[PDB]
Amino acid sequence: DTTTVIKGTIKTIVGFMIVQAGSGFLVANFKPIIEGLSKYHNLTGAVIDPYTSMQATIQTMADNYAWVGYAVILALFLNILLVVCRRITGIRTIMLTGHIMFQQAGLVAVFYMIIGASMWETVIYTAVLMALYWGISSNIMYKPTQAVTGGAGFSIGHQQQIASWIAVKLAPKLGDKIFHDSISATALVMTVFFGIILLSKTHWFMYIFEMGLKFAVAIQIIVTGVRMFVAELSEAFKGISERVIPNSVLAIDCAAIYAFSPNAMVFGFMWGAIGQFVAVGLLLGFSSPILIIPGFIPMFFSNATIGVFANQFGGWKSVMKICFIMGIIEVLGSAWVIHLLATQGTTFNGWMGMADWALFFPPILQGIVSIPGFFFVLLTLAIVYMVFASKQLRSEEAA
Amino acid sequence: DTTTVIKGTIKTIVGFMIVQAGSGFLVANFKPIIEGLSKYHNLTGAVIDPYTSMQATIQTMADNYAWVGYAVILALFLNILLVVCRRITGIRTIMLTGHIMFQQAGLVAVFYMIIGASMWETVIYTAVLMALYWGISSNIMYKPTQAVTGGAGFSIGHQQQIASWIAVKLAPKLGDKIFHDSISATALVMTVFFGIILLSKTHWFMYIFEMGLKFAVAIQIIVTGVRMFVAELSEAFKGISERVIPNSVLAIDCAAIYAFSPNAMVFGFMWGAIGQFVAVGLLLGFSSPILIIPGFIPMFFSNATIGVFANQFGGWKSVMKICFIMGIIEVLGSAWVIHLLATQGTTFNGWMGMADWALFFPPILQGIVSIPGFFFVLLTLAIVYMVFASKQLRSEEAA
Ligand SMILES: O=C1O[C@H]([C@@H](O)CO)C(O)=C1O
Ligand SMILES: O=C1O[C@H]([C@@H](O)CO)C(O)=C1O
Ligand SMILES: [Ca+2]
Ligand SMILES: [Ca+2]
């Protein structure tokens, strides 16, 4: 092969270069807006979006951003370890989507850096926490994913597995049985939210739409850059998982189940956007020191997947209620995490803003804030799920 | 349509912000290199490349780049008039390649601004020169294109029509009868040119490859932004030419003849890159006040088209001679234009660098600098063609 490895390396470097270009075009049009919030009132000022959080992670991670690559490879190795020993661990699924791994491990690593831990503590803690989150989350969501997909034989590996598990366990008690697309979407989101800020002439509105288009363009360059940056490496992840665990379960993208229920889409994402709208209204009401700018990606994908599971297990009513609560917890939890990051000693402007990154990981990051022994407590919980998963697997294959 | 109009406007705007993104990445990544050429030896420091010259045009024009659009539309209207009156002008061809129009009218307009003319003078003179160059230069290469393409029914509307004419007539006396593709090409070319600069360690060569990759990424973002920004308005131009002159002859991109001769591509580009290497070697040996950085687009495409026509009319021998001399004239003539634009009162670190933009336009800009009446001279020259050409058309319709 050798040569194709060189091709992959050069292509990934080009990817990170495009990420840097989109980051520059994003910064040169928004630093006087947050720094503009300094010479105004309560500073920051944050955007709920995974790619913006990846940008802020890179910029506040410098050349130490390679720790995210070390932690991604190491965490992937630990997940492969959790699948090879599926008999005593009960973990079958494996995480392989590259950009989701780099986003998640990136935010965890930047958390362990804002606190101020060493390099190896960040790589090891990030690897263990991320591997347990992937195997336990997807392996937890395997069965209901089989219920939604009609037994297709794959699980969900994204950023809302635990929230979708709250929808699976809570739904039966509430109901009865890409250029201009993303640019227009996220741009319209920025313009709508800016119009909401107006609730607290054609020239200023034209600058609203133009700010939405500059922001959306920057985010899109970031999207393509990240995708090409993790494309070949994730393809190698499939190359190794292809041979080490050939009969494993794949934790693929959440969108891969949207076609199994295209009805919970616009409605689930609709009430998720309503939840985030109400939550941002509450934030602007209480004069909170943190302003949240919602994004299209976590709304549509997170609240639409939770809309899918809440639809299959609890109909449109469970979609409305549970998805609304999910959006509120998304915005409020993101602002809370940003408060932690600010008090920990670093100015961070982005956050994942998904469902499992503004509901389940805020309490974990707060747990590491409280005690360094909270991590080993999380490991004991991982054994609590692990031994029972082993017993259920043994009593599930032999019976 | 109404809706698709505002849609297309949003599209062109978005494309323009992508252009600004690649531009910011480019100048932000390569400012200290030319500024380093200030604090060392002779300045400039120029890039033979169409998209870089378009970026520098948008830079040295700022909020006055709309004049380029005005001159593009007006020149289009003038060409439409010349084809409507094809009986008394002998003009069959019509240029519709929009991005070539914006590049050419952009450089001519930015020359008519750097010299200090007003808005209406720059728009009028640029529209006239562009209309006469497109209609006359593309109308000249109609029949030889029919001989090369076997009568495929189109002409060539690009950047080397005049050099293709000098090759067509100079040839018979000399012989017997796209992401990582462009990024890889231009990156390799930057590494080669930097290797020739070294003709005057792993960290140094790896940073050569990294600077070439950054420049390639910036140039590629500029490419996508230009194509998107132009696609809609050029599609409107084609929509008007569909109904005003349906039976007209289309002057299309030059590469559409490469399929009729895939052999002259790598050899014409071979001796063209050789000519660029020799001429740049002369600019380094003579200690010229202007350094020249070659680009992949001018070499490959200019010397490729000239290699195809000079191949059809004068074999591999005329390919070697005319392509080599054409490359030398490319480098030396472009650096010439950079010298004149330097004395005229501004700095311009990059030129179109194609065949006709280093052989035919340097003397035009020099003549306009000397006396403005020279412009009127060209106008009279057009009549010396048009009138004559007029009769020819009749002598080829009824005879
Ligand atoms: O969290 C994310 O969701 C989308 C996509 O993976 C969903 O299909 C994306 O690009 C992310 O970073
Ligand atoms: O001048 C140019 O030549 C190439 C292409 O048109 C040749 O096919 C390109 O992208 C330009 O902008
Ligand atoms: Ca490969
Ligand atoms: Ca169209």
Author numbering:
A (entry chain B), B (entry chain A): 37 to 213, 228 to 250, 262 to 460
The paper states:
The phosphoenolpyruvate (PEP)-dependent sugar phosphotransferase system (PTS), which catalyzes PEP-dependent group translocation, is used by bacteria for sugar uptake where the source of energy is from phosphoenolpyruvate. The PTS includes an integral membrane transporter protein IIC, an enzyme IIB-like protein and an enzyme IIA-like protein forming an enzyme II (EII) complex, each of which is sugar specific. UlaA, UlaB and UlaC are the components of the l-ascorbate PTS EII complex, involve in the uptake of vitamin C and its phosphorylation to l-ascorbate 6-phosphate. EIIC proteins are thought to use the elevator mechanism, an implementation of the alternate access mechanism, to transport sugars across the membrane.
To obtain the inward-facing conformation, we screened different possible mis-sense mutations of UlaA from Escherichia coli (ecUlaA) (e.g., G58A, G286A, and G58A/G286A), or homologs from other bacteria, e.g., V. cholera, P. multocida, and M. pulmonis, in which cytoplasmic UlaB is fused to the C-terminus of the UlaA domain. UlaA from Pasteurella multocida (pmUlaA) was finally crystalized after being proteolyzed with trypsin from the wild-type pmUlaAB protein, with a best diffraction of 3.35 Å. The protein crystallized as a homodimer in the asymmetric unit, and the structure was solved using molecular replacement with the ecUlaA’s core domain (PDB ID: 4PR911) as the initial model. The final model for one protomer contained residues 37 to 460 as well as a molecule of vitamin C. According to the high sequence similarity between pmUlaA and ecUlaA, a nomenclature has been adopted from ecUlaA for the structural components with 11 TMs (although the closely related protein VpeC (TC# 4.A.7.1.2) apparently lacks the 11th TM), four hairpin structures (HP1–4) and three horizontal amphipathic helix segments (AH1–3). However, possibly due to flexibility, AH1, TM1, AH2, AH3 are not visible in the crystal structure of pmUlaA. The substrate vimtain C in the structure of pmUlaA is located close to the membrane surface on the cytoplasmic side; therefore this structure is identified as the inward-facing conformation. The dimerization interface between the two protomers of the pmUlaA homodimer is formed with the V motif domains, which is a large and mostly hydrophobic interface, with a buried surface area of ~894.8 Å2. The core domain undergoes a rigid-body rotation of 11.1° and a translation of 6.68 Å while transitioning from the outward-open to the inward-facing conformation with the substrate-binding site unchanged. With the availability of inward-facing and outward-open structures, the conformational transitions of the C-terminus of TM2/TM7 become clear: the C-terminus of TM2 in V motif 1 undergoes minor changes; however, TM7 in V motif 2 swings about 46.67°.
